[PDB]
Amino acid sequence: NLNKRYGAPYVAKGYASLDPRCSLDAYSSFQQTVTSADMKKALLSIDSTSSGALVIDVRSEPERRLRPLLSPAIVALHPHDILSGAACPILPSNKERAEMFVVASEAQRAVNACTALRRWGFSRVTAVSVDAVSEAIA
């Protein structure tokens, strides 16, 4: 005689609180764009004397050797350290005010890593540009 002791958020609960909707919104941010100004605002977040790297690149370790972008001290996270939740101890506190970015080799991984973020309670990230952040050297 459950749901009398436990709530309705029992038995009628799709304990899959992971990704019924976020994955979609991940493919939404994939669609719009990211460009210079979308990095230039992040440049101001690098211009902010408080240095916490904004964008992160989820790319294989041989890839980054080929096009090194590590210049502004941005964070290089293996895409599982994001998915698995091992990266939350280094992730902004303001889940609703922060928007980092996610660079990736091919834009499928980026959105596939940014959906992991939005599963971790993060709200804004437009989630890709492998080539812009190099054209925005900063």
């Binding site: 294989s60 370790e61 041989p62 890839e63 050797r65 080929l66």
Partner: protein, 275 residues
């Protein structure tokens, strides 16, 4: 509780047998069952059930299977544990040449995750080639061999060194041959024919994952719904309800609410004198 004089003399109130070592495996011996003589993860292997006494005599080192894996690892019938790289060389200066020869494939049978796409330069297959050729060339030495190849020869990419193994060697013969030990080359050829192979197996694995084959990281099939492109509940595809559609209004059985001003159908009771 009910402890009574000694380790393993705990609860002593349930009637189980203490001092019985429940951790130890059952001596299944003669009994025939898939659960025989198998570490519990190997229970699914019902095609090689390990029942029978001889499997009891040889999993445990019983009578004459007393050293059972009569040929375990640490014997090689072929090369008897001596490295097959000739040190007896004509000139002592060139003894270091043969170092780094491939004794087998070294790259395909292991199945490493070479995440290098086949269009990278050659200098990015050095971290793989090394792990099998240390004790032959320092890591920073390879990056002197795996660059003179890129500079001197017409080969640049992992895909090239897999499509031009003939054109590469002929360069090495007529241009290298004094610095780059051909050990590197046949190692360089063994990875470039793998990185190219795996990328074909990855690029295919990604190209089925769209066509809907959907296998997990460990490659077991997992069936999962496709993404929605239209309305979730079917409308022009709906199957008829399946229960005789005598609506709630043709036989006002229940669940029907009507304003009291708008009471219908009393043509003999109270609609004959409507208001």
């Amino acid at each position: 509780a009910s402890t009574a004089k000694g380790y393993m003399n705990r609860v002593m109130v349930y009637a189980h047998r203490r001092r019985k070592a429940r951790y130890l495996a059952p001596k299944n011996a003669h009994v025939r069952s898939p659960l025989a003589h198998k570490m519990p993860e190997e229970y699914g292997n019902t095609w090689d059930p390990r029942s029978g006494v001889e499997w009891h005599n040889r999993m445990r080192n019983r009578n004459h299977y007393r050293h059972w894996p009569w040929a375990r690892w640490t014997d090689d019938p072929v090369r008897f544990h001596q490295d097959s790289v000739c040190h007896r060389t004509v000139s002592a200066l060139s003894t270091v040449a043969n170092n780094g020869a491939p004794e087998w494939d070294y790259y395909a049978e292991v199945g490493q995750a070479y995440e290098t796409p086949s269009h990278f330069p050659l200098s990015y297959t050095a971290p793989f080639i090394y792990q099998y050729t240390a004790q032959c060339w320092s890591r920073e030495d390879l990056q002197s061999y795996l660059e003179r190849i890129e500079q001197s020869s017409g080969l640049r990419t992992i895909a090239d060194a897999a499509s031009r193994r003939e054109a590469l060697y002929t360069w090495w013969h007529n241009a290298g041959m004094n610095v780059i030990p051909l050990g590197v080359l046949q190692h360089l050829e063994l990875v470039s024919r793998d990185i190219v192979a795996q990328n074909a197996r990855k690029s295919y694995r990604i190209e089925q994952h769209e066509r809907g084959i959907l296998r997990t990281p460990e490659m077991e099939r997992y069936y999962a719904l496709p993404h929605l492109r239209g309305p979730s509940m079917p409308v022009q595809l709906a199957q008829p309800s399946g229960k005789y559609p005598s609506g709630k209004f043709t036989q006002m059985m229940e669940d029907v609410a009507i304003h009291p001003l708008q009471k219908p159908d009393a043509r003999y009771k109270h609609n004959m004198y409507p208001a």
